[PDB]
Structures are given as C-alpha cells and as structure tokens.
Write a protein that binds this ligand. Sequence first.
Ligand SMILES: CC[C@H](C)[C@H](N)C(=O)O
Length: 234
Amino acid sequence: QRNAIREDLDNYLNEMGEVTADNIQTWLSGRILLIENAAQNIAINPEPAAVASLLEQKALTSTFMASYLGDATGHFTIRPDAKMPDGFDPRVRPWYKGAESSSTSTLTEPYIDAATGQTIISIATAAKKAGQSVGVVGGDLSLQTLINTLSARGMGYAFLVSADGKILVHPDKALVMKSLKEAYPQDTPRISSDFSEVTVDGKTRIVNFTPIKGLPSVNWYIGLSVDKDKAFSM
Ligand SMILES: CC[C@H](C)[C@H](N)C(=O)O
C-alpha cells in the first residue's frame, strides 16, 4: 500500500523543505540587508564617532545581540558596549576572516561569542569605500533565536546543515556542530540522496535536504526528518 503513494510522500516532503528554506531565506534576508546598510553607511564616513552613532541605533540594537566594526589595525567598536576578554583581537575572529574571504556579505557557522560566551552566528561584510576595504561589520544572532526560527512550523522537524554535512542548528542542541556521520552514526543520511530512510532508535525516519536559495557566500541546506509511520499516516 505504501509503495503506491510513496512518490506522493516525496512530493509533500519536498514541498515542506522548500517552504521552510524559503521562510529562513526571508527571515535572514532583512537582517543581511541591515548589516550591509550599516557597512555602506560606515564607508560613507569611517570616522569613529560616526561609527559609534550608527551602531547605537535601535534598528540594529533591537535586531542583533550586538553589532560592531573591526579594522586591520586590530581596533573595534561594539554596540551595545561589552567587556571583551583580555587580548581580544577582531582580526582573528570567524566573522572577520569570513568577510575578508568573500566578495560579498557572509554568514558564519556557529561559534563562541567573545562577548557573551554563548554560541551564536554572525552576519558580516567588509565595508568598502571606493573599492578599498575599511574594515568588517557584523551582527550577532543567538543559536536560540535560530533554533526558535526553525521550530515555528507532528511528523517531524527541521534543522540547518551546511553543504559539507555539518549540522549548524538543530532542536537537539547536542547535535549542533556535529557532522551527519557523527550525529547519525548508526545509519547516516546522505545529502547526495533526494531521500534517506534511516533508523533512529528502532524507528524509521525519512530525511531530505533542501538548499536555501539567496544567501550570500554560504551554501546551506534545510534538513527535514520525519517519522515514516506518521508521514505515511497523512
Ligand atoms: C566585537 C566582536 C563580537 C564580540 C563577536 N561576536 C565575536 O565573538 O568576535
């Protein structure tokens, strides 16, 4: 009976994957624009009084945990202000290196925030004034915000996985920054497969992967994992 509507279930799961990727792409896109705008505006006049005033504005401080500018001399400005660890250097941080490596904006993987000590991600971009970089701007979003975004939509759940197979954001915090192989050792889903049927705790799940279109610099996927019996029962 299943083998007759199995192509049907594929169609629903692909649809659910697409919708989820679309939403995330949309939620991130406005935040990417604010950081880009901040960087465009800094490049206007990169005097440090100006920078501070821009990063203090409510549109940025209500949207990000903090935003900041770092330069090639090692200096930085962060708003809201925070006590940084001794010897903190913005140049070595994943937002800075990421932004300098790309011709456009970028998004980090999860990393440990120097300010709060919590796992976050960052949107970052180089502020270019007339072709020349003047530093890197970024904004921090917490993993909990990202987890909350994903879990909005009883078959299953969504998670965010990079195109290298590293889980970035998953409702089970234990699996954050684990590869697929490490998180699903017994029976590993493969991105190369439209659908991967895997056993988790003696139950079959169906896992697909949907690319998130329209992100700058990164190729990430939405993963969907659904209980096979619940999915078919539907
Ligand atoms: C000023 C940079 C901030 C603190 C960034 N979240 C970092 O951890 O590097």
